[PDB]
Ligand binder design. Structure first.
Ligand SMILES: O=C(c1ccco1)N1CCN([C@@H]2CC(=O)N(c3ccc(-c4ccc(F)cc4)cc3)C2)CC1
Length: 295
């Protein structure tokens, strides 16, 4: 008599059968999160995290959105957090977009008729832009916190010089330095918390993953003229990763009839984990923007 194989587990050894999950098109398990209101939801909102992090970093923002009677959902992208995959490896950037679409499609089946929004930060913001561009007219709105639109010219040059070797030769272990958290938030407590979270990937960016991030920038650039979804764009002027010029480029090139930009003077990259004055303002502005577009 044949027997079923040992239960499939997260990279942290927890059986997926004990957790909310989804199996993507490549047969990889993605860990899922849900924050649902007690009544009937007004809308659905997908939360898209960035490179090296995971959906658990959005707990407070998700609970604020749930308090507005929206059903919030998320997953850890492939190679991240509690999902499967070689850490910070992706065969092609589109895998991230494909997986977001599968989860959105799955959720719209269980809750039909509801409008669906996207919220993304950094690489997760590039994913949100590409997801909306793939389905024009389908999403009710998008909230972008420092999206990857234009990379910091210094970081782009470093990755274009490191790609030069990998694209022309076989160098599977080639990597750049790790994500420097101290220059991504002025809130030292938040930097310390990020540095203490075991689910964050602290290794240096592999050149093959940096190539997929440069692909994402190129794809976002082509997608901008086709974007029509309503969006709220939050950007810090002292962003060392996602150059503020990209936020201005997104306001200029998108065709969306409903687009708004809020610049946070002197703020660093991670606006939702910045100084309390900035983070409180970010939560308030997202609350107002989504409240005005839901009923
Ligand atoms: O919560 C925190 C935190 C709290 C306090 C301090 O930090 N986070 C740290 C930053 N991290 C970002 C997510 C993401 O996509 N990152 C990233 C973006 C572009 C790149 C990029 C690099 C080179 C390039 F050429 C293009 C893009 C690299 C990484 C980072 C979000 C989570």
């Amino acid at each position: 008599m044949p027997e079923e194989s040992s239960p499939r587990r997260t990279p942290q050894s927890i059986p997926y059968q004990d957790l909310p999950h989804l199996v993507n098109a490549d047969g990889q398990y993605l860990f899922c999160r849900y924050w649902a209101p007690t009544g009937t939801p007004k809308a659905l909102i997908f939360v898209s995290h960035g490179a090296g992090e995971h959906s658990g970093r959005y707990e407070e923002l998700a609970r604020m959105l749930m308090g507005l009677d929206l059903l919030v959902f998320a997953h850890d992208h492939v190679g991240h957090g509690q999902s499967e995959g070689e850490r910070m490896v992706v065969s092609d950037f589109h895998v991230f977009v494909r997986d977001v679409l599968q989860h959105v499609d799955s959720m719209q089946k269980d809750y039909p008729g509801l409008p669906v929004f996207l919220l993304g930060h950094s690489m997760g913001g590039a994913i949100a832009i590409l997801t909306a561009a793939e389905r024009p007219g389908h999403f009710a709105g998008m909230v972008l916190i420092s999206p990857l639109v234009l990379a910091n010219p210094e970081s782009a040059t470093t990755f274009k010089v490191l790609a030069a070797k990998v694209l022309n030769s076989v160098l599977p272990n080639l990597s750049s330095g790790p994500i420097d958290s101290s220059v991504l938030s002025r809130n030292k407590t938040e930097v310390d918390i990020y540095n203490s979270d075991p689910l964050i990937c602290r290794a240096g960016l592999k050149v093959c993953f940096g190539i997929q991030l440069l692909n994402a920038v190129s794809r976002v650039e082509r997608a901008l003229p086709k974007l029509t979804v309503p969006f709220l764009l939050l950007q810090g002027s002292a962003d060392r990763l996602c150059d503020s010029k990209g936020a201005y480029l997104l306001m200029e090139l998108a065709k969306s009839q409903d687009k708004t930009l809020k610049i946070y003077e002197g703020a660093y990259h991670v606006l939702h984990k910045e100084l309390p004055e900035v983070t409180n303002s970010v939560f308030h502005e997202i609350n107002m923007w989504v409240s005005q577009r839901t009923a």
